[PDB]
């Protein structure tokens, strides 16, 4: 029975290859060349924030583009004021191994994860004049790698046990579970229309997931090694991915293909975290050689390099107004560029 | 704007209040030593854990001669560990445990050691090695009916050590075997490595209690070597 299943799976693979081939019309490079060049967008540094001991693993800007939050490996969460370079809320952590953090879209909740296979949620607006842990969710069988809200009652969690899930704070259970990766999943980003999202995993493939129905909509290939960076275009009909093979790529959901690859020759260390921009013209990536890069989207050229970090870089994020970007590396510092 | 001015003053007060506690916590973070306790199923990790404890992630905290030690073991994870292994790059030294008797699953252990000793985020950490279950080793080798050359063909021509510290209640065969295994583990640690981290082996058995002083000596050697490389003094 297994031989017949493998044979029909190979037939389906051939059919899907034919369907992908038929949809191909022309390359993006030739048709994007007629555009005028973007030009040098070399940037500089601004206010630098200090006061962390060990390295950094996550950072999420916010909505009003004025606050931010960062997590470190001494079990320390800190909420920063970007404008006046201060501190407002510093919270300890129960488990000293934390991997991913996030800021709520409403500017009211802070989410933290880590290696304890449990997710903790902190309510900034308190009725007793102190940050206290209200809710924690459990049920996974492996390390967490992302926790990004939809609203004040929905969150999507991704675990190293090859599963993602959608939770509800009031009931604290799993409403729906997304399974079927056969590997480890690392990073997810939602969509501007708040209807679908994606999951990037070590299986060398990405997937598109929907919240209401639950079943996966489509799958994407192309990368060889582990995938460890993903984001979403402003329109919601594209997404760029970064993996360990030091190659970034772009996918369009409508065409269901891979459009452009941003490569080079003197790059041998892989990407770690990426983000997009406001107009859809700047695409930011962090690498391992202690330097970060800013590419252009429509064309295939790079004009602009960010430097100033000693150890490896981990977190990177653009604003909701395009005013600036934030970047954090494995040396307990956070640098803000404009 | 006077309300705004005093609000800004209060915010600066909040920043100062945060900074004070951060300094108080930094004073304590840097005076503790954290170690990993990697091992396998056939080996014995719980015995050592109890020995240094009678004095998803499970922790043992102990203290010798007014020096504090924190120790981590990871059992709640899945099989693969290529991703959560990088959370340990400021660890002072790893601990590795290998069963000296069960010869079928010996090679496997060796392979793991190589991956610890040759990496990017693990190439600046020292390793303390424990070959456990010595009594079973002696009994099994002395009783015969188990050729070492069956699994390691390069043992028959092995030469006994030029120097050693054999107890008076020992015979040439047990010393021969228990030194062949130790040099087998030691050969990997000297081929590569540009004088940044070392290996410190010991022999241990189930009935043992002085397995915490060895940790003190090893850690002191590690810290001294790391300090003398910054002040340019060989």
């Amino acid at each position, epitope marked *: 029975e297994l031989d017949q299943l493998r044979q029909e799976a190979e037939q389906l693979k051939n059919q899907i290859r034919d369907a992908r081939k038929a949809c191909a019309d022309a390359t993006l490079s030739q048709i994007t060349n007629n555009i005028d060049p973007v030009g040098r967008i070399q940037m500089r540094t601004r206010r630098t924030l200090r006061g962390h001991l060990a390295k950094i693993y996550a950072m999420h800007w916010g909505t009003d583009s004025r606050l931010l939050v960062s997590a470190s490996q001494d079990g320390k969460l800190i909420i920063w004021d970007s404008y006046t370079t201060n501190k407002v809320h510093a919270i300890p952590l129960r488990s000293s191994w934390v991997m991913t953090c996030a800021y709520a879209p409403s500017g009211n909740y802070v989410a933290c994860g880590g290696l304890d296979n449990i997710c903790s949620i902190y309510n900034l607006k308190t009725r007793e004049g102190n940050v206290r842990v209200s809710r924690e969710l459990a049920g996974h069988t492996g390390y967490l790698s992302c926790c990004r809200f939809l609203d004040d009652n929905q969150i999507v969690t991704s675990s190293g046990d090859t599963t993602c899930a959608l939770w509800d704070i009031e009931t604290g259970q799993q409403t729906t579970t997304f399974t079927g990766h*056969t*590997g480890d999943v690392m990073s997810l980003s939602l969509a501007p229309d708040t209807r679908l999202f994606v999951s990037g995993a*070590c*299986d*060398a*493939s990405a997937k598109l997931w929907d919240v209401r129905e639950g079943m996966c909509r489509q799958t994407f*290939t192309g990368h*060889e*090694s*582990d995938i460890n960076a993903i984001c979403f275009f402003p329109n919601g009909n594209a997404f760029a991915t970064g993996s*360990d*093979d030091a190659t970034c790529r772009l996918f369009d959901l409508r065409a269901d293909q891979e459009l452009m690859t941003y490569s080079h020759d003197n790059i*041998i260390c892989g990407i770690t975290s990426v983000s997009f921009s406001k107009s859809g013209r700047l695409l930011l990536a962090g690498y391992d050689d202690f330097n970060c890069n800013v590419w252009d989207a429509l064309k295939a050229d790079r004009a602009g390099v960010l430097a100033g970090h000693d150890n490896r870089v981990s977190c990177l994020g653009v604003t909701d107004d395009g005013m600036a970007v934030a970047t954090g590396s494995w040396d307990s510092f956070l640098k803000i560029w404009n | 704007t006077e309300d705004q001015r005093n609000e800004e003053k209060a915010q600066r007060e909040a920043n100062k209040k945060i900074e004070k506690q951060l300094q108080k916590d930094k004073q304590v973070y840097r005076a503790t030593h954290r170690l990993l306790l990697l091992g396998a199923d056939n080996s014995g990790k719980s015995t050592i854990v109890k020995q240094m404890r009678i004095l998803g992630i499970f922790e043992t905290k102990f203290q010798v001669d007014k020096v504090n030690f924190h120790m981590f073991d990871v059992g709640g994870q899945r*099989d*693969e*560990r*290529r991703k959560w*292994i990088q959370c340990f790059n400021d660890v002072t030294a790893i601990i590795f445990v290998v069963d000296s008797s069960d010869y079928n699953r010996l*090679q*496997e252990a060796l*392979n793991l050691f*190589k*991956s610890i000793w*040759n*990496n*990017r985020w693990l190439r600046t950490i020292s390793v303390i090695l424990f070959l456990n279950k010595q009594d079973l080793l002696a009994e099994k080798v002395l009783a015969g009916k188990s050729k070492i050359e*069956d*699994y*390691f*063909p*390069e043992f028959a021509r092995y030469t006994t050590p030029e120097d050693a510290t054999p107890e008076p209640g020992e015979d040439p065969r047990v010393t021969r075997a228990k030194y062949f295994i130790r040099d087998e583990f030691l050969r990997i640690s000297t081929a590569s490595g540009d004088g940044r981290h070392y290996c410190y082996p010991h022999f241990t058995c189930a009935v043992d209690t002085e397995n915490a002083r060895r940790i003190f000596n090893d850690c002191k050697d590690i810290i001294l070597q790391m300090n003398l490389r910054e002040y340019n003094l060989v």
Partner: nanobody
Amino acid sequence: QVQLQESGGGLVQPGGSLRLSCAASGFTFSNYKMNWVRQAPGKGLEWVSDISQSGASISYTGSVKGRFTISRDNAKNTLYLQMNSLKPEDTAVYYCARCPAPFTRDCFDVTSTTYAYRGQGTQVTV
């Protein structure tokens, strides 16, 4: 996508000789360290032999130290293991593994319950 398919396997008389070849497609073959994995009935997975990036460093296991010869082919993008003077104790399923990270000198989790870079494998009887 990434694909690795093995070729070989069958009934072997004692003291026989065979060659097992795994072909791969979907990546640059000259940047990856690869090896072999075995599974005999009633037991778990085990390691046998391995090659380095440029075909310079080779290593084996003690159980088979003078009977096996492994060799890569970067031009034809294949890996070969040659078996001579077999033994009745070997009758197993063979897998052509792959180490994850390019441009590196180590790899974890080559032997695992599920890895997702491992070929299907063949089965040999002696």
